[PDB]
Amino acid sequence: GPLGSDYIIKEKTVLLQKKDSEGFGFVLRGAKAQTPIEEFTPTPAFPALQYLESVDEGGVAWRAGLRMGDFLIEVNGQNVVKVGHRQVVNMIRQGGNTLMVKVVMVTRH
Amino acid sequence: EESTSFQGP
């Protein structure tokens, strides 16, 4: 609008279950940090540190509804909004062939 | 920032 950006924000909860011989079918990207970044302030347009750089077309993540740009809010019921990249990677790996993730998709109107 | 692929196992 005239006073600033309008956004559609869509929450998605998905449970991925894969073979040992395949990936979840995404690339994760975001801020590194030894412990959770307290100096980061989430905003509706950048609501979390980690997001999906890409999602493999037809892969596990794709089939469940995950898309490029989705921001990671929760991994296996733990909030990761202000959690550094390596810790989130370790949390994804902890479930093995099972990953429960809550994401927010941010689109311009 | 850092990237980690989960495209393969």
Give chain B positions within 8 Å (CB) of A92. Answer: 6
Number of domains present in the structure of chain A: 1
- Pairing type for strands A71-75 and A98-108 reads antiparallel
Q: Is residue A1 part of a domain?
A: no
Write down the residue that tokens 């956004």 correspond to: A7
Handedness of CA A22, A24, A29, A35 (dihedral sign): negative
Burial readout A26-49 (b: 16 or more C-beta within 10 A, e: otherwise): bbbbbbebeeebeebeeeeeebbb
Resolution of the experimental structure, in angstroms: 2.0
| C-alpha to C-alpha distance for A69 and A36, rounded to whole angstroms | 21
Contact B6 A23 (CB under 8 A): yes
- Residue in this structure with the two tokens 């959770």, named with its chain if needed: A36
Range of the domain at A69: 8-107
CB-nearest partner of A22 from B2, B4, B9: B9
Dihedral (C-alpha) A29, A31, A33, A39: value to the nearest 10 degrees? -150
CATH number of A90's domain: 2.30.42.10
Selected for mutation to probe chain A from B1, B5, B6, B7 (highest A CB count within 10 Å) is B6
